Design a binder for this molecule. Structure first.
Ligand SMILES: Clc1cccc2ccccc12
Ligand SMILES: Clc1cccc2ccccc12
Ligand SMILES: Clc1cccc2ccccc12
Ligand code: FES
Ligand code: FES
Ligand code: FES
Ligand SMILES: [Fe+3]
Ligand SMILES: [Fe+3]
Ligand SMILES: [Fe+3]
Lengths: 192, 446, 446, 446, 192, 192
């Protein structure tokens, strides 16, 4: 993509297009689909420890940002463009998991209900690290609790996955640029 | 409802009618007597440091543009075109010499002046009086050590006087530390609570911490962690509470410089705060140097809250009686290493931001307490804030304000709601002053 | 609107202003004069049989905890903490000796008493008067053969007297059958209708069945199926209608013991009901034994409805003028075989539950009739309920109440709305009684 | 708010209080004084040409059924059953001899009469007076060259008189062209704007076009394209503005027969309009023949707008103060080739329909201007409409009405809001007339 | 999954994880995807008779439950945990289909519009019945009617499918535990 | 499908069922999935020029209709059943793309955020034109802008795709019958 011509496209987004448009490996797309479907199943049933053990690499960066609204023509204002809703290493994810599982987490009774919908899966091996797998996918996440509270989240996920212990592919990076600037879901206390 | 006569807050701030968290007519009345009258947080110098830099902010339900002028001052204006009322600015921050309306193209300067009108000569000739068509300006804009507040009411006390006895407690961290920076952009989330629910919680609620935040205390291993599940009460002399004439107040938890930050930041922070404290002893005295590195949970009346040391900075932006838009920034000390500033900012959001696991513990408490204020059998019920009543003092030789010399109590609720009731029942600042001429006596009764 | 003077329901209940289904000010007024004054369904013995068992229920827009006491009685309390008003219980049912608030940890007993306060000695000392801080208790809680109702108004008539002439019709099934059980949990769905729309429909609307439910009648092959598409009118003597002083009423469709249940349950039910009827002849007489196995469509004023024999049990929980939360339980006879109870419960939900195909036929009718009450040209229009007027009787030797001796009519609408208007225009029970001293005369005019 | 006394629109229509776009009490008041009093667009002959053809339409927040009678006339009725108020018709268009209610099966004729009641003889006997139970009929239904308008108020002026001086401008296209057809079905979209925002924009806002629609002008290459980004001002004599006693008004852009249509339709349209103009010169004179092929942006008070030649036809259906349901049809000249009609209709929707790229340019302008009317600091602020004031004329020898002899100005805003204020402050048509006895003098002051 | 460690996980949910984590058959996942996409197409166009004929086995149990909200720590209260929004055999499904198709079903005029989104498909053969196919999938179901009524449903489906007449795979069990306790969709009159 | 028996089914819908129920080609379904996922990626990052160049054929008809609500039993009223929300040739799509990219499109600052979810993909070659590929798919489209504006669109897409320049498969027809009659999304200014 020529971003001088396609005026609305960011350099970052153009780079990610390039990644999937070349060596298409159908088998890889299917492996990636299985991997993400299984991850979502573990999360949906709130098997957070199993998620960490089976899906999350020790070197993970799990990051969800919220970008400040700026003018399309802005060229002078240079201050921090985004904040981190999440920017977690493995230990920080573990803290969040223990918080979910704590019997004095009053908000988790009655038990929450999660349903995740994973679509638009794309996969490509890294060019330089032949053991690094880039996976892109979109998620709709439905959270229901307490009779009539319903929150629906929507996001694109830029992932890197790598073979870890026992040869199991695990998440080493997730990046989400959350599309809604002001959340209308009470909080973002869900694992996208 | 007759707001001159209706007792919404009982004598000494001992209780409040539950309807205050739910009644939409009262919410509309608060727009006039609370939000249009009092000082509201806008931004920090650090977010608009250069000429032309601007941000948008809410003041009550109104939106304003807050702009750094060429002379180094800051002016704020309604984000509303003077022609046919279109919203002028649709972004949150930027740098510009002015703002052009997307409807008919009127151009306003960063100074609010109407500078250009398309085809003015051919259309209006000389008949448009542009001098009288500047953006509606916020009457008062003042700074407290870089933190910029606005007030629509020209009659308000200066910001420093408005902070009253709270200023003394804030100064060690806000001034004597060498200054703070606000790290943006903020997180923004809507909760289904009245703005007063989180405001009252931050101003004076240490009681809730061990129980509400049991899971976060147990999971994060922060320094206040001994409190998890009410397993332990803070020792005597662990802290105090204070409140002030114009409603601002806070809790002080002695020495708690690492605040809510998980064990990963505790040693670094406790080292940094202790080192600066040692330098400050010589400058401002032992007590005030200790306050600098003590955890302050504060509300600057009406709807700006913070946790110093933890570095959490909040605006509870009102939407309706059961809807509030929560803005969350991080505050850092300017002379901290940049890498520490970055980690501290992430940790503020990790704990109290949009996916803040501590802040999440508070959701149901704030939302249901607010929503219950609409329920028929609860409207005329009494919310209690009597803990510690009869043991508060005023005029203490060491700690100013109305002060409860204990870590956990409801002193700061009482002062917050005393000021709230005096405003709701008053038509202007002069009437508030008359209604507040015995404010500390009322709070220290029995 | 002046509710003392405004004629919302015309003389003899012949018509009602359409605005009653849409006006939010009137909805707010109903919270006071209908829901805070009258008996409202809570639960059944079968759902809280053991000490410590509790459920939550709505009473109007308020939520209550309904708890089985150690002495075998039932008490109900506002689901609102006495400290700062947080919702105490977040589940629908359970068993506990008490309830602890998730905000500051106050602990209330199943008897509503404030039993514990964290760190009470250190914080409050001896100054907290816990005896005065019990949960706000529902003043009146009474049982009709296991069905538990509550009333916030201490001045209400006893539940049995409140049921008035309706009790006689309910007793064969509720009492003489050996007793009913409520099968939970209920289905719960929000519809965009006023609570009065389904309440009026169940109290007295046999006219709608053949047309509204044409498709369900034709598809399910239940015993009322001859009615599909108005293909046939019920024969003379097929049924009757009744109403009562305090607003409760019902239709009676003779012998219709299998009700709305599809052909898969018809032979089994018709056998079971007929067998019990034969035993009941000797105990309560032929007429009342026949009533036992006759289909009753009833509303217990204001917002509890049922279809006996079909086994449908409804609460129309009010949310606002055009929003109602529908709770649907199944009622079964205790001495039915367990497998029959299970199939009957599923069939109740199949027909009238959240995916009830019969109940679905009613959605547009109730929702649009309610929403039209907000439309400008319809607010002051008259909803008609004159069918059968001038042919009702009172004091009949065989059937008590105001009675229309025909299967299809609007007798029970008239009694429902007569009571509704008497409440809306009254400030208390004494005034309702004064406004109702000629209730049956008004209904039997012409 | 006292609508007799409150100055919502200043003298000569020079300004309006911003609250008019946001205040819900005023919205409710408009239902009475604007929508229940004035002429509202229903349908076109072309959409209900045959006996039995009907459509549903909104009149204010009410819904009506508009039906072609056997005698060739059109009658309109509330879409509300006379029994218990259910919505009778759930579709948008069709052909039928009557309408049966899905609740209890009452059957109404296309003439609104109650024709049948299920089992009437057995249930009501002779006691139901069906003659008095016809659907509530719209009092006035009149046609302007096939365009059908309704009015609930029997006292309204005839539609032709109500159009006042605007009729003269519309006639060349509506009458002398041989007649128009409305191409349905319309697009339907909800916007978060007050109905007055798009109404005022279409009645008189040429100023916004070059700036608001910069991107659409630049991208589509239509004939008004020289305006993109305010790159060029229309030459002198490019057009005029007009307004009238009862509030209708329009802009005239000379010769702009291809309007907003992209270059793909420009040559064909400019040929067609020019050819008909040459024929019309001999019939109606050069000026009026030129008006025929000139672009008119018009609002027929209160909430019907159009762009002639572009062929856009709009209804701004009110929902609440910040919600409007936008209906968009295409108008075509009957004697255009069918293939041209089809392409013109698609082009109308392409530019101004639900995905109309021009209409999209207006969204934020209308929505934010409306929503700002709720904001506390803006409610009492003044929206300006003074452009061109002091240069309008009345009684001109060539162009009737209050006329601004310039293409861009606010003449038509002033007339629209003068009529609006006279209605809001009046209880009936007689009072409006009294309040309007010097209407043109007020508008041409200075 | 160890549900003593993963405290939020139900025994039932842990059993279903186990089913798909073992013999992964890629071809089976794709067969299951086709089967469910075709079923959803038939339902979306309201071909309810075709759905019964082509997709639904004679021995079907079609079940959607609503679970009462109970405390996470509850151990004493033992009464019926759930009610059946649906619990249908083939004849009961047929009744519902005839109700939909009846020309006096006034609610179906004007014609409703359905759009279904099926994601997260997993498939595994039963261990003991080699002719029984377990299929898990999530659905978003959008129903639009009467101008401005829009209802969106979200659910996970636990299915069993088996080869029936002509060798065509048909649904013999569907189980849905509906995630929202109080419905905000007017009713649940849709086939999930 | 027999539409005399399946009373709710339109002749058009029955014809489209027939198309996918016969020669199932698994490889084709996967090619179609890739094609649609890549198209959605280009649209989501607002690479509208790239979308035209890579995804849209010169002979395209891009059509979204809104159908007037009529009685199920209606047989007499014969006037235009639908209007065209979109009915675009390539040049008309280009106009819309230039409108999106214009620096004076004030509504595009701050930059919009799009997330698309493509599901239920079916593919079949045309019987008579062996170079014409029929693709059916459903889309959820999430558009977020200006802090708190969120609009979600739902639709089924009937596409025809054909190999064009360089052998790249491109859209030659898209047809959507939009399921909601009155839009509650401010506008339909999104490419479904
Ligand atoms: Cl961390 C902390 C300590 C004391 C009081 C507090 C009030 C509110 C939020 C956090 C607090
Ligand atoms: Cl099934 C039945 C019979 C008679 C009257 C009814 C009223 C309401 C619902 C069902 C009824
Ligand atoms: Cl295209 C055009 C020209 C002049 C005035 C207008 C007002 C509204 C919409 C379009 C207009
Ligand atoms: S509304 Fe801003 S220029 Fe007109
Ligand atoms: S609100 Fe319940 S203990 Fe404080
Ligand atoms: S409401 Fe129309 S027939 Fe009864
Ligand atoms: Fe807290
Ligand atoms: Fe019914
Ligand atoms: Fe415009």
């Amino acid at each position: 993509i020529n971003i001088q011509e396609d005026k609305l496209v960011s350099a970052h987004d153009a780079e990610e297009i390039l990644r999937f448009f070349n060596c298409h490996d159908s088998a890889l797309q299917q492996e990636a689909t299985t991997l993400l479907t299984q991850e979502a199943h573990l999360l949906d049933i709130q098997a957070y420890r199993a998620w960490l053990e089976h899906c999350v690499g020790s070197e993970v960066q799990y990051q969800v940002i919220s970008r400040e609204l700026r003018a399309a023509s802005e060229r002078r204002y240079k201050l921090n463009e985004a904040m981190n809703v999440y920017n977690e290493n493995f230990q920080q994810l573990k803290v969040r998991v223990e918080h979910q599982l704590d019997p004095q987490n009053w908000g988790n009774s009655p038990k929450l209900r999660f349903t995740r919908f994973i679509t638009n899966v794309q996969a490509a091996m890294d060019v330089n690290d032949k053991e690094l797998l880039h996976i892109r996918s979109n998620v709709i996440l439905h959270r229901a609790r307490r009779g009539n509270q319903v929150d629906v989240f929507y996001a694109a996920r830029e992932d890197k996955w790598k073979r870890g212990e026992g040869g199991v592919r695990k998440l080493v990076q997730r990046f989400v640029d959350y599309p809604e600037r002001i959340l209308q879901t009470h909080n973002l206390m869900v694992f996208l | 409802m007759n707001y001159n006569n209706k007792i919404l807050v009982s004598e000494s701030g001992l209780s409040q009618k539950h309807l205050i968290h739910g009644d939409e007519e009262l919410f509309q009345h608060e727009l006039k007597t609370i939000f249009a009258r009092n000082w509201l947080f806008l931004t920090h110098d650090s977010l608009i440091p250069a000429p032309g830099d601007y941000v948008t902010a809410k003041m009550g339900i109104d939106e304003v543009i807050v702009s750094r002028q060429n002379d180094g001052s800051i002016r704020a204006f309604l984000n509303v075109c003077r022609h046919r009322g279109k919203t002028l600015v649709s972004v949150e921050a930027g740098n510009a010499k002015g703002f052009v309306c997307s409807y008919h193209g009127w151009g306003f300067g960063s100074n609010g002046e109407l500078q250009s009108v398309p085809f003015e000569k051919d259309l209006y000739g000389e008949s448009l009086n542009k001098k009288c068509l500047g953006l509606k300006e916020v009457a008062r804009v003042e700074s407290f050590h870089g933190f910029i507040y606005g007030c629509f009411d020209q009659e308000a006390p200066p910001l420093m006087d408005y902070l009253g006895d709270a200023a003394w407690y804030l100064e060690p961290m806000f001034k004597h530390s060498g200054g703070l920076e606000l790290v943006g952009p903020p997180g923004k989330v809507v909760i289904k609570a009245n703005w007063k629910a989180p405001a009252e919680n931050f101003v004076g609620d240490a009681y809730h911490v061990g129980w509400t935040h049991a899971s976060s205390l147990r999971s994060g291993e922060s320094i206040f962690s001994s409190l998890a599940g009410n397993a332990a009460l803070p020792p005597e002399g662990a802290g105090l509470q204070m409140t002030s004439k114009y409603g601002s107040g806070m809790g002080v938890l002695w020495d708690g410089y690492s605040g809510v930050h998980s064990a990963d930041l505790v040693p670094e922070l406790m080292a940094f705060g202790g080192a600066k404290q040692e330098r400050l002893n010589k400058e401002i005295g032992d007590v005030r140097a200790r306050i600098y590195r003590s955890h302050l949970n504060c509300t600057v009346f009406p709807n700006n809250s913070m946790l110093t040391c933890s570095g959490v900075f909040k605006v509870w932006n009102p939407i309706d009686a059961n809807t509030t838009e929560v803005w969350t920034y991080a505050i850092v000390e300017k002379d901290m290493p940049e890498d520490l500033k970055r980690r501290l900012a992430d940790s503020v959001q990790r704990t109290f931001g949009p996916a803040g696991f501590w802040e999440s513990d508070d959701n149901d408490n704030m939302e249901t307490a607010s929503q219950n204020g609409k329920k028929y059998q609860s409207r005329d019920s009494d919310l209690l804030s009597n803990l510690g009543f009869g043991e508060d003092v005023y005029g203490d030789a060491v700690y100013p304000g109305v002060v409860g010399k204990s870590a956990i109590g409801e002193t700061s609720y009482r002062g917050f709601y005393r000021a709230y009731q005096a405003h709701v029942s008053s038509s202007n600042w002069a009437e508030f002053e008359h209604a507040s001429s015995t404010w500390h006596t009322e709070l220290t009764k029995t």
